[PDB]
Structure formats: C-alpha cells, structure tokens
Amino acid sequence: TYHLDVVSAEQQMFSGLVEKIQVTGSEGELGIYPGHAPLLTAIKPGMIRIVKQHGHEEFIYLSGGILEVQPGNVTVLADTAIRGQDLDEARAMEAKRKAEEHISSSHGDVDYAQASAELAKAIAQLRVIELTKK
C-alpha cells in the first residue's frame, strides 16, 4: 500500500505503511487510498483514522496542521497533535466546559476569534474521544 509519516515539533506521532486513512481537510473530511489524488492542503481542527494491515484502526487528534499526499510516502505535519489514549474522553468533556464558559465570557469580536478556536479545539477532542471507542 502506501507509507504514512505523521510528525509534530514535539514528537513523531506515527510512521509506517497503512492501507487507508480518513483525514481532516480545509473544506471537509477526506478519504485517502493508494495512489490517491496528489494533493497538499491545510487542515481544520479534527483527527485522523489510521486503518492498518489486518484492518486495525487507531485514532490521532490533529488540533492543527498541513498535509501532503502526492508521493507514495505521504505526510501530515501537525502544529499540535495528541495520541488517542494520552487524551481521554473525560479530558474532552472538560474541554467542553472551558469552551462553553469562554463563550459566556467572550463579548467582542477579537476575543470571539480566540473563544471560537478554543471551542474548535474542544469540539475536535469531543469527536476523536468518541471515535476512539471503536
């Protein structure tokens, strides 16, 4: 199949051959295959599904990043990413608490631009922790 490398300035998050991945993108979530469309893009706050040989998924949080899928060695670069069991479902539910408090505690436009990103980080965590249960 194809080889995926996922890195951040803090760590290498994954690297190896993979059969399929479903990945966050700029306009919406995107499905990848061997010889998929040779495309580079920015990504929204979200996650990636890593379905390996014998069909085994794992779930990686992608809080921010840029990707490349043109070569047979594909690549996600993450401005922040967290491994799917270092985060927890309880931690993301706390993330919901902060986002909803700052929505109540934001009142202008500039602070709403940060509170909207603080919400997006919580919502993307709240997404991967449910997916993590599969």
Partner: protein, 57 residues
C-alpha cells in the same frame, strides 16, 4: 553538527532559494500535484514552517 559524542563538525548550508540542486521526485512523477484552493497561503505558510524547522533544529 553533533556527529559523535566526542566529535562534531562545523557546517554551512543554504535555505533560500530552496535549492533545486535537491532531487526531483521522479519515482512519483506520475503523481503530479494538485493544489488545494488558496495555493499562495498554503504554500507560503508551509515554507515558513520549513525554514522555522531548519533554523530551530
């Protein structure tokens, strides 16, 4: 550069212009690339992370 616990080498290398001396990806030449919309921003911001990464490392 840290080539050994007790030997290190002084080095100079060019970041810009991003050297076309480096190889073309001819093995993957069949897969010639498609931009995502807003290719200026995606390419510029990506290259800023490249030079940021090269300098910090």
């Amino acid at each position: 550069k840290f080539i050994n616990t007790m030997s290190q080498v002084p080095t100079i290398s060019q970041l810009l212009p991003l050297p076309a001396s480096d190889d073309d990806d001819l093995k993957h030449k069949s897969w010639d690339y498609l931009y995502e919309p807003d290719p200026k921003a995606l390419l510029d911001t990506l290259l800023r992370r490249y030079v940021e990464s090269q300098v910090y490392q």
